[PDB]
Amino acid sequence: AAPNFLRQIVQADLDAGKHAKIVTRFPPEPNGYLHIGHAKSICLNFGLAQEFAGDCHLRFDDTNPAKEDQEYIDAIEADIKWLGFQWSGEVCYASNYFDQLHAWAVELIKAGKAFVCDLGPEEMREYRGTLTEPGRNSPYRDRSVEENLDLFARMKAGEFPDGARSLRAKIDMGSPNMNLRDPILYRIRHAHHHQTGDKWCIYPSYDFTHGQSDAIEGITHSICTLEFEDHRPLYEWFLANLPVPAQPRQYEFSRLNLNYTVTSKRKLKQLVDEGHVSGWDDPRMSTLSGYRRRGYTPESIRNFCEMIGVNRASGVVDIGMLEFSIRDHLDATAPRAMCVLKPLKVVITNYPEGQVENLELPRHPKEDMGVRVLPFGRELFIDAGDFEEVPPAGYKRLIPGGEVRLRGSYVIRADEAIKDADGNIVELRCSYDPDTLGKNPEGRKVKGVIHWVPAEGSVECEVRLYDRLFRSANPEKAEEGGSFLDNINADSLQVLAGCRAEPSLGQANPEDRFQFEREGYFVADLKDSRPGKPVFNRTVTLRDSWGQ
Ligand SMILES: [Cl-]
């Protein structure tokens, strides 16, 4: 619903009679798992290309030599495919461009627009200056082209140890823009690269790789977050001073800032490494893997991204919007079922023992989704919460001598509560009114309707009740001497054993989603569900409990 300024930019080109296909890219570093914030970038880059029949590349920004790239490459590809998108052509890797990048660096040296600098980090930082205090030229800035070429070649050949010298662009140490103050282009690092192995011991900087990768790929619209807005002059400087094959243009959008959420790599790691969650794909984690395992649908995430739009204004999005999105999608699309979370045995005293009625309940109140068969008979389970000896005001379920409707079934009456030696109710003996199937009793009213399952045929199962991992809107903000862990929601997970699902749920497959009557929306966990024995995660409650 909200405006998307990039959509309007592309449409204006069309309105002006321009027919060039758009080419976007999603360019993550393969060094972390994606989170919900990345879904906005994914929906933006792939979605724009889809909308206008262009291309979106997947590019791994793998310029850094690291050991565990493949783990992250695989996970990132799986998230993108799960969201339903497809990159055009082959997967791209920034490391594929190392030869060309090095060639272009030599061109800058030859044009007197780059130099080899020997300054150590202390001097390098001191010479850099600040936004208010202008920097100083490196003492090596006036090296000859010949000397720069020789030193750079010797860097590439592996002559010097890590950090001994770097190649820098020669721009302006007095620039009000820090990125134009002779930025580093190459550093020495003797390290094995996941793609190119031991071939390189010089590696290019983010800025030297970024726009040049875009040009090589023929990117038309290079989309990044506002964090890199002040990099645009440098992005443009390289394109203006290199014989690049294309002139991609950079656009910046405001990142997704959800409340109640942590997305920072270091805090996520601590949550995982210290056992606050089960792993990176814990249903409470803001990872895309976590969101999937929670039961969110790709539709709900794409719908949410569409709803918040794309703009250049920083601002917080309430996580209730995302919770609404999955609520809305599952309300419309998910089959209904009954699962008794806290079972209480019920005996229908005037129901003939050994007899059964096979009631048929629609899987959806509106869609043509078939029926579930619910055997009704003498032995049932209801939720223990739906009977009270001493009811609170407004209570609408079972009380002693009182009635309740069983969903899609009969009106029953609580006639005797059986208690154990400790005073716990272990059985509720009820009568039913055989004239009430699909009919209200004549001359009296029944206040409430509850879910229920047959005792014989119910599926025993584990149900995990999930809620927000954090209980405050800005969890990273803590009191003096505290941390973000102080804001953890102690009620974020409740594991229930011995729940009683209707028989039809015995045929649930991993990732099947349901509305559990009067309880919420649930998914059969993709890892722990096995045939005949689902394990259910609560995806979201029926209605908002947190407010805003
Ligand atoms: Cl860098």
From Swiss-Prot:
Reactions mediated catalytically: tRNA(Gln) + L-glutamine + ATP = L-glutaminyl-tRNA(Gln) + AMP + diphosphate
A GO molecular-function descriptor: glutamine-tRNA ligase activity
Sequence motif 'KMSKS' region, location on chain: 262-266
Superkingdom in the source lineage: Bacteria
Biological processes per GO annotation: glutaminyl-tRNA aminoacylation; glutamyl-tRNA aminoacylation
Enzyme kind, highest EC tier: ligase
Motif, 'HIGH' region: chain positions: 28-38
Keywords on record: Aminoacyl-tRNA synthetase, ATP-binding, Cytoplasm, Ligase, Nucleotide-binding, Protein biosynthesis
Positions annotated to bind ATP: E29, P30, N31, H35, I36, G37, H38, A39, K40, S41, T225, R255, L256
CDD domains associated with the record: GlnRS_core
Positions bound to L-glutamine: D61, Y206
EC number: 6.1.1.18
One Pfam family from the record: tRNA-synt_1c
InterPro entries from the UniProt entry: aa-tRNA-synth_I_CS, Gln-tRNA-synth, Gln/Glu-tRNA_Ligase, Gln_tRNA_ligase_bac, Glu/Gln-tRNA-synth, Glu/Gln-tRNA-synth_Ib_cat-dom, Glu/Gln-tRNA-synth_Ib_codon-bd, Glu_tRNA_lig_a-bdl
Cellular component, GO annotation: cytosol
Subcellular location: Cytoplasm
PANTHER family recorded: GLUTAMATE--TRNA LIGASE, GLUTAMINE-TRNA LIGASE
HAMAP family: Gln_tRNA_synth
Protein family membership: Belongs to the class-I aminoacyl-tRNA synthetase family.
Assembly mode: Monomer.
Record's protein name: Glutamine--tRNA ligase
Species, as recorded: Pseudomonas aeruginosa (strain ATCC 15692 / DSM 22644 / CIP 104116 / JCM 14847 / LMG 12228 / 1C / PRS 101 / PAO1)
Gene: glnS
